[PDB]
Amino acid sequence: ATQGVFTLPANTRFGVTAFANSSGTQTVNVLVNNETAATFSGQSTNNAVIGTQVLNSGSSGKVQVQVSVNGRPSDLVSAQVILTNELNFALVGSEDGTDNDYNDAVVVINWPLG
Amino acid sequence: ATQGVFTLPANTRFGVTAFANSSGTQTVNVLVNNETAATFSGQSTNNAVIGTQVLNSGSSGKVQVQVSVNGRPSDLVSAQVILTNELNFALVGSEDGTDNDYNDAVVVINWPLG
Amino acid sequence: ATQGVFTLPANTRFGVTAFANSSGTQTVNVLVNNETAATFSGQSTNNAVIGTQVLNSGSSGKVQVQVSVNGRPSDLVSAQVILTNELNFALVGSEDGTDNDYNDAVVVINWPLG
Amino acid sequence: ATQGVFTLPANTRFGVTAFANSSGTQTVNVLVNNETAATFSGQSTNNAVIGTQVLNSGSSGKVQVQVSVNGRPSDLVSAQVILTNELNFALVGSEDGTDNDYNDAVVVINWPLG
Amino acid sequence: XXLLXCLXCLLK
Amino acid sequence: XXLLXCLXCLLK
Amino acid sequence: XXLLXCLXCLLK
Ligand SMILES: [Ca+2]
Ligand SMILES: [Ca+2]
Ligand SMILES: [Ca+2]
Ligand SMILES: [Ca+2]
Ligand SMILES: [Ca+2]
Ligand SMILES: [Ca+2]
Ligand SMILES: [Ca+2]
Ligand SMILES: [Ca+2]
C-alpha cells in the first residue's frame, strides 16, 4: 500500500521534523499538493534532528513524505494517530538497507500548531 | 487513566523531543526508572523544538513524561504506536489551559536508534 | 482529556464491536450526534463479542462510546489510527474496577465498510 | 515492509477477530510461532464477524496474520497501538481487489484478556 | 490502591 | 578495506 | 508578573 501520504485539513499549519539513524545521508522531501515544500538533508547514527519546519497544507491538504539515500528511494512505513479527537501525528519510518530497522530517517508530522 | 508512562525494552537508547505550542512556558521532565533524566524548558507558539536528547531506557525500561506550566501539571494524553513490528513511537500531548488543543507541549519518543 | 469521542466523515457507515473482559456486566452505548444508535449489554471474562453493529455517522459524524457497569461510568481510554491514509480504527478501552487492565469493555470502530 | 507480524509478550492470551467487507470469500490464517493456530473463512459486505478466537502467544510471542482470497494473498496494512501502557491492539487491514479500501478483511488482535 | 481503592475492591 | 572502508565498517 | 500581568493571567 502507498505509505507516507497524508490528507490534512486544507490550509493548515503543520510541523514536520526528521531524525536520522543510518550511516548514509538521508534526503527527506516534503511535498504539498505534489510540489516540493521542504527538503531536509543530514547524516547521523544518533537520532540527530536533520530538519524541522512549519509548513502549510494548502488548498488540497495533500502532504507526502519521500525519503532517499544517495539518490535511492527508501522503503516507507507510515500511520496517522489522533489523540483526544484533536491532536494529530503523521508518522513515517524508512529503510535504506537490509537490516529492516526502519529508523534510517524518521519523520514526524504534527498538527494543530499554536 | 495514567498517561505519559511507557515501558520500553530495557537498556535501549531512545530519542526524546519536545515541541511547544502555547503562550505558557513548558517544563518537560523525562524520568527513567522514576529518576529525572532530562528536563526541557521553552516557549513557542510555532512548534519550536524546546529540547531533544538521546537517553537510555535503563534496567527497568520505565519512561515517564511530565509536563507543567508555572508549577501546575498539565493534563496529558498519550499512546504508543509500533510500525512494521520494529519502529516505536511514544507520543504525548498536553493541555495547560482550557482550549483543549492538547499541543501545548508535544513530546515524541522514538526507538530504536542507530 | 475527553475519551471515546471521534469525528467521522458525515453520512458514513461504520462498524462498532464490543468485547467484554470483566466479572461485571458491561453496557456499551454508541451515540451518534449525541443520541444512542446502538446499545450492547453482555458479560464475559474471555473476550466474548457482546455486540456488533453497522451504524451511519449521520449529519455531523460525531460518534461517542460510553461504558457503564451497574450504572457507574467506566474510565475510558481511546485513540484513532489511520492506515494507508484510508483505513480507520477508533479504539476504546475501559476500566470498571481497581486492577487497571482497561479491557473490561473493549470497543473497536472501523470504517469504511463495504 | 513486512505487515501483519506482531511480537506479543510470551505466554499471553489474546483475542483475534476478523471482519469481512468484500464480495470475495476471505481466508484469514493466524500463525503463532510460524504455525497455524486459527483459520477463519467467510464472506460479507456488511462487516460481519467471520471468526473470533482466543489464542496463546506461546514461547516466542510471534503472531502473524495472513489473508488470501482464491489463493491470492491480499495486500496487508498493519500497526500496533498501546493505550495507558497496558491495553494493546494489533490491527490489520487488507485489500483483495482494485479499489484500495483495505477493509476486505479487517483483523483485530487485542490483549490482555480477562 | 488507597482507601477508596480498597473500599471499591471490597464492595465488589 | 581502506580508509572509507574502515569508517564504513566501524560506523555500521 | 506585576499588576497587569496577573490580571491577564487570571482572565486568560
Ligand atoms: Ca536500516
Ligand atoms: Ca538505522
Ligand atoms: Ca492548550
Ligand atoms: Ca496550544
Ligand atoms: Ca479492570
Ligand atoms: Ca478485566
Ligand atoms: Ca477492496
Ligand atoms: Ca471492501
Side-chain angles (χ1 to χ4, degrees), chain A residues 1-34 36-71 73-114, chain B residues 1-71 73-114, chain C residues 1-71 73-114, chain D, chain E residues 1-3 5-6 8-10 12, chain F residues 1-2 4-10 12, chain G residues 1-3 5-6 8-9 12:
Chain A
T2 300
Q3 298 286 83
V5 175
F6 310 102
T7 302
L8 273 65
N11 296 309
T12 295
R13 282 214 303 164
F14 65 94
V16 58
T17 302
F19 308 85
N21 290 284
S22 171
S23 70
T25 296
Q26 304 295 306
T27 306
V28 178
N29 275 296
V30 184
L31 292 77
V32 175
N33 200 7
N34 305 312
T36 300
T39 299
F40 304 151
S41 178
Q43 188 279 316
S44 175
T45 55
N46 199 39
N47 208 53
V49 176
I50 61 168
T52 188
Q53 194 164 332
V54 174
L55 295 172
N56 190 286
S57 66
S59 66
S60 79
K62 181 186 177 179
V63 177
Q64 174 167 12
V65 177
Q66 285 173 159
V67 179
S68 58
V69 175
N70 302 338
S74 294
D75 189 47
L76 306 184
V77 296
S78 59
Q80 182 182 342
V81 184
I82 314 187
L83 302 192
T84 194
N85 201 39
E86 162 74 9
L87 182 64
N88 287 256
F89 299 89
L91 309 166
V92 180
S94 62
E95 179 50 53
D96 64 29
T98 54
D99 70 343
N100 298 331
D101 63 355
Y102 279 84
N103 71 357
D104 301 324
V106 174
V107 184
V108 177
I109 285 165
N110 68 292
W111 77 96
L113 305 190
Chain B
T2 302
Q3 298 283 265
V5 176
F6 309 102
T7 299
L8 272 63
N11 303 125
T12 299
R13 294 171 91 228
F14 64 97
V16 59
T17 302
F19 309 83
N21 290 279
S22 176
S23 282
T25 294
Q26 308 294 311
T27 302
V28 176
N29 206 54
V30 184
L31 303 107
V32 175
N33 211 343
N34 308 131
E35 301 178 9
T36 297
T39 305
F40 307 141
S41 185
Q43 183 275 323
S44 176
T45 52
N46 300 309
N47 210 47
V49 172
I50 65 173
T52 188
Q53 194 156 332
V54 172
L55 296 174
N56 197 292
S57 71
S59 63
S60 77
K62 181 183 177 182
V63 181
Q64 178 162 11
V65 175
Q66 313 174 116
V67 183
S68 69
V69 175
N70 303 136
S74 293
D75 193 46
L76 306 181
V77 295
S78 59
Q80 182 181 342
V81 188
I82 312 181
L83 308 187
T84 193
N85 200 40
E86 172 69 17
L87 176 65
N88 287 255
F89 297 91
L91 307 168
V92 178
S94 59
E95 179 52 49
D96 64 30
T98 55
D99 73 338
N100 296 330
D101 62 357
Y102 280 86
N103 74 352
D104 301 323
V106 174
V107 185
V108 174
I109 282 163
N110 68 289
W111 76 93
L113 308 184
Chain C
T2 298
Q3 300 281 265
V5 175
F6 311 100
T7 301
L8 269 67
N11 283 337
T12 299
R13 286 175 151 209
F14 65 94
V16 61
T17 302
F19 311 83
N21 292 279
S22 176
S23 279
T25 303
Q26 306 295 308
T27 296
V28 178
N29 283 307
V30 186
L31 296 94
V32 176
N33 302 317
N34 301 316
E35 299 148 5
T36 301
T39 306
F40 306 142
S41 185
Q43 186 278 318
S44 180
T45 50
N46 201 38
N47 211 51
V49 174
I50 60 166
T52 190
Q53 183 54 237
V54 173
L55 297 174
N56 193 106
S57 67
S59 64
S60 308
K62 179 179 176 187
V63 178
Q64 176 162 11
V65 174
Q66 294 177 149
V67 181
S68 57
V69 180
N70 297 332
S74 297
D75 188 51
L76 304 179
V77 294
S78 64
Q80 175 180 351
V81 62
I82 312 180
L83 303 184
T84 194
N85 201 40
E86 158 77 9
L87 178 72
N88 285 256
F89 297 86
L91 308 171
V92 182
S94 61
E95 181 47 54
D96 65 27
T98 59
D99 70 344
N100 298 330
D101 64 358
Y102 279 84
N103 71 356
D104 304 319
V106 173
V107 181
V108 174
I109 287 162
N110 67 293
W111 76 96
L113 302 186
Chain D
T2 300
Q3 299 281 268
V5 174
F6 311 100
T7 301
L8 272 66
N11 302 119
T12 295
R13 171 179 303 241
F14 65 96
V16 58
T17 304
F19 308 84
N21 293 279
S22 173
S23 284
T25 293
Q26 306 295 308
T27 297
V28 177
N29 284 295
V30 186
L31 294 305
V32 175
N33 208 358
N34 305 308
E35 302 176 350
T36 299
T39 303
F40 305 145
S41 187
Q43 187 276 320
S44 177
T45 48
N46 314 106
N47 206 49
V49 172
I50 62 163
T52 187
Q53 200 162 320
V54 170
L55 300 166
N56 187 309
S57 71
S59 82
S60 76
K62 177 180 186 180
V63 180
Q64 176 162 16
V65 177
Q66 299 171 321
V67 181
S68 61
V69 175
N70 295 324
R72 174 187 74 255
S74 299
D75 190 37
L76 306 183
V77 290
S78 57
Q80 183 180 345
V81 182
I82 311 177
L83 305 183
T84 192
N85 198 41
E86 164 76 7
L87 175 65
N88 286 252
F89 301 87
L91 306 165
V92 179
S94 60
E95 176 55 48
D96 69 9
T98 62
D99 67 351
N100 288 349
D101 66 355
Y102 282 87
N103 71 0
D104 302 317
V106 173
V107 182
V108 175
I109 285 163
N110 69 290
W111 76 94
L113 302 193
Chain E
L3 173 70
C6 210
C9 179
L10 286 322
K12 172 64 172 283
Chain F
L4 196 276
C6 207
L7 300 164
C9 155
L10 294 181
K12 295 170 140 303
Chain G
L3 193 79
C6 214
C9 173
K12 190 139 144 44

